[PDB]
Paper text:
To obtain detailed understanding of the molecular basis for the broad substrate specificity of [name], we solved four crystal structures of wild type (WT) [name] in complex with different acceptors. The determination of four new structures of [name] in complex with the [name] donor and different acceptors enabled us to monitor conformational changes in [name] upon binding of diverse acceptors.
Numbering used by the authors: 7 to 295
Amino acid sequence: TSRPPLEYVKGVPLIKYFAEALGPLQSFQARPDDLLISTYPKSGTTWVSQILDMIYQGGDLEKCHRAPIFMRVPFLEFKAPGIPSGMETLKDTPAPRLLKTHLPLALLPQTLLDQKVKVVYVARNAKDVAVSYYHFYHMAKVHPEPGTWDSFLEKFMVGEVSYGSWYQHVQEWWELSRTHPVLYLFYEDMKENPKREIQKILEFVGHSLPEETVDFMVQHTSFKEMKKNPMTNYTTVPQEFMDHSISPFMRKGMAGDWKTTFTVAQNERFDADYAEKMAGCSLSFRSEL
Ligand SMILES: Nc1ncnc2c1ncn2[C@@H]1O[C@H](COP(=O)(O)O)[C@@H](OP(=O)(O)O)[C@H]1O
Ligand SMILES: Oc1ccc2ccccc2c1
């Protein structure tokens, strides 16, 4: 009940509240005009969510401020003390709907694949993911005790963390994109050049918008502005759920900062394990710009 342990479901370790959440998510019916944001945690979920809302409100910042990002974009598997569940919020979210998930394919509602819903997947280099994930486990108190960074890094390496293996995740959603319509984006690409990536998102969802407006989205989806913005920075939630004084949700927003956490030994060891997990995969990751 106090940083409870994970619960395994069909091979996926989950926050127990999210596992419970899968029951009522059995009753979820996807529409053809839905869009699923899919990511392994800490990969840029909130960032594309805010890009996709701004696209959906025609650039209108003021509408984007109607509520926090987690109410504008129902988080499918979500459940937590004192906050409405993904499924509850979904009931008051109007089509065309933006949905957020981290579920491995093993757990994904089949209705999203049968209905051919557009997915925007965001992948990020595992080193920055592990580091962000580690800080995230401290502030987001439903998560089990993270322990030392070292022991969290080893845990992360055998996917013995919330939502399981990053390795299997970025690969399985990469393969899905052959039989299913997936825009597969990279957080690093979004760091290098946010406007290229936003226009690709737009190409994907079929909106054209003017450059006055694009440029405008760019600036309002930057790290500095999304840190300032309380409908995107998660400071509106109760302190018993997320404690930003331990670690803020919007942390550094950088690519390449893993280097200030990983030791040299951790790095050599991670890289050897990495080359072995990722062998036979066309996927190429930039671990810095
Ligand atoms: N506008 C933005 N630009 C770059 N990174 C952003 C961002 N908004 C949030 N992030 C980062 O994306 C990560 C959160 O991902 P998710 O939303 O998938 O949980 C955090 O990274 P760090 O902890 O590396 O700073 C957060 O700082
Ligand atoms: O992607 C997310 C977002 C918010 C969360 C809050 C608590 C636990 C996991 C979470 C994962």
